[PDB]
Design a binder for this molecule. Sequence first.
Ligand SMILES: CC(=O)O[C@@H]1[C@@H](C)O[C@@H](c2ccc3c(c2O)[C@H](O)[C@]24O[C@@]2(C3=O)[C@@]2(O)C(=O)C=C(C)C[C@@]2(O)C[C@@H]4O)C[C@H]1OC(=O)/C=C/C=C/C=C/C=C/C(=O)Nc1c(O)c2ccc(O)c(Cl)c2oc1=O
Ligand SMILES: CC(=O)O[C@@H]1[C@@H](C)O[C@@H](c2ccc3c(c2O)[C@H](O)[C@]24O[C@@]2(C3=O)[C@@]2(O)C(=O)C=C(C)C[C@@]2(O)C[C@@H]4O)C[C@H]1OC(=O)/C=C/C=C/C=C/C=C/C(=O)Nc1c(O)c2ccc(O)c(Cl)c2oc1=O
Ligand SMILES: [Cl-]
Ligand SMILES: [Cl-]
Ligand SMILES: [Cl-]
Ligand SMILES: [Cl-]
Ligand SMILES: [Cl-]
Ligand SMILES: [Cl-]
Lengths: 223, 227
Amino acid sequence: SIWSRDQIVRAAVKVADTEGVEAASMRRVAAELGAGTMSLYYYVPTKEDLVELMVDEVIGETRLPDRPGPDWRAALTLAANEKRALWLRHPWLATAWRNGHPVWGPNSLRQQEFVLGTLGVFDLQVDELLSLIGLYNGYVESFVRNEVGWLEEARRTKVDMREWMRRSGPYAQQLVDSGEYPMFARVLAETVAPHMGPDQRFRSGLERLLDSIGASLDRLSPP
Amino acid sequence: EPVSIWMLSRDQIVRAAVKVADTEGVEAASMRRVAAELGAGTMSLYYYVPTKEDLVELMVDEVIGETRLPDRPGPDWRAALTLAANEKRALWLRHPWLATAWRNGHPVWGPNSLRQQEFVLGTLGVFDLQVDELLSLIGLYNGYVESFVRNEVGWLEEARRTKVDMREWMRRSGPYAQQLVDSGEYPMFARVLAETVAPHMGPDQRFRSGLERLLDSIGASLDRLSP
Ligand SMILES: CC(=O)O[C@@H]1[C@@H](C)O[C@@H](c2ccc3c(c2O)[C@H](O)[C@]24O[C@@]2(C3=O)[C@@]2(O)C(=O)C=C(C)C[C@@]2(O)C[C@@H]4O)C[C@H]1OC(=O)/C=C/C=C/C=C/C=C/C(=O)Nc1c(O)c2ccc(O)c(Cl)c2oc1=O
Ligand SMILES: CC(=O)O[C@@H]1[C@@H](C)O[C@@H](c2ccc3c(c2O)[C@H](O)[C@]24O[C@@]2(C3=O)[C@@]2(O)C(=O)C=C(C)C[C@@]2(O)C[C@@H]4O)C[C@H]1OC(=O)/C=C/C=C/C=C/C=C/C(=O)Nc1c(O)c2ccc(O)c(Cl)c2oc1=O
Ligand SMILES: [Cl-]
Ligand SMILES: [Cl-]
Ligand SMILES: [Cl-]
Ligand SMILES: [Cl-]
Ligand SMILES: [Cl-]
Ligand SMILES: [Cl-]
């Protein structure tokens, strides 16, 4: 287990933020530091290891409270906004982890202590805790991975979410006119969210997610 | 102003891209490599398929046409979502690049994708829901399936590179997990390792068990919002 390297990781991060993670190849990160590649490899064997070290490294930028306190909705909300701002700042976090094994670096584990801690006081089987936290973490990640995706897409096409929605209007009408997608149509007729800006959309999605967690907790702990 | 891709034939270009991606991942199936395979030339394909992103979008909807969900909702929403989940996981396992290839913000609105979405969205259509609430609960369900299978594929890919699978990784990491518990700093990590069952089930049993807890949470929200 992979758990001064640190200065290597920081230069990697700087490159990945600007030019994407592919561009943070091992030759370049050397260039960035003013060293030749042969020493880099001593401290950081593989590019897979570096990505893992970068993940943990940037999570160290963030600081949550030492303990969540009893308001699990306010604590998860704080964790949500921190995590979103970290992914927007380091968009490669949304697509870079390709492996199955979890990252057990100190900073990753510190933050999970806080997020798991929020529902840690409840008398739940731990796999139920992980299931509810899974719901919460899934919402934040799906949303922001999609957000990042729009930005990466815009830089190529010059068409962002709002502009894509307008230009897709005619195709959408064709699909409605097909008559084969009555639920898609009811979504297009009735949804409010896509017309909210990003910050308000995220927050209102988070409140719905939090209410679903809440409703589960009332089930397992009436009333 | 480009028109949607959805607005020598297309179907043979796509089926040919799918074969190179199945066997050798989505990178090994470019326009160059797809031309080669068909017995045709680099620029003739750009008539049918302008961009590689356009090509991937067609590849996704093509393979989604291998799954056939029912025409109609059914009152048992738990069974419905379970069927959808099992069918999505089998697909993704047959086409692992499904888990990673979609990197854009815009949704794939091919016909096979939307045919499948009618069934998934129709499952809670029974209920008195504002549409954004429906979408929120479907989001919880889809995120479960998607994280699960994408992690499952991650392990398969990691293991080809390392020759160390999920079980061998848990085994090999015991000493370090034990150092981490001994530090005293990670009490929730310790509890998880001491009490979790899931990662000791096989994948199929673990998939189903997590699904069941998810469905119970959907049920608790439906009861509150729509008695
Ligand atoms: C995330 C996302 O897609 O955001 C979209 C956004 C980018 O665009 C939004 C949008 C576009 C265009 C317009 C609109 C939009 O909101 C204006 O609402 C609008 O319709 C517009 C208009 O043009 C107008 O102007 C227009 O021009 C045309 C029409 C007809 C209406 C309008 O005049 C007026 C109206 O205001 C719709 C909006 O659509 C959605 O939010 C869709 C979300 C639904 C999620 C469904 C997921 C379902 C899960 C699911 O299927 N699970 C899966 C499985 O279990 C599964 C299992 C097996 C398997 O094989 C598969 Cl493939 C599976 O696939 C799965 O996905
Ligand atoms: C997905 C995953 O990690 O699966 C793991 C699997 C691969 O390995 C499992 C495992 C490993 C080792 C062992 C075990 C396992 O089950 C044997 O159970 C075992 O413990 C093992 C042993 O070695 C033994 O043998 C052993 O050898 C050593 C010890 C100490 C115990 C044992 O003798 C007893 C037993 O046999 C644990 C298992 O761990 C989990 O499932 C944990 C899941 C929890 C995820 C929670 C995520 C949290 C979300 C979250 O943080 N959200 C986020 C934020 O809001 C967030 C916000 C801001 C921000 O900056 C960040 Cl970074 C953020 O990051 C976020 O992630
Ligand atoms: Cl990147
Ligand atoms: Cl590597
Ligand atoms: Cl955007
Ligand atoms: Cl290409
Ligand atoms: Cl792939
Ligand atoms: Cl495995």
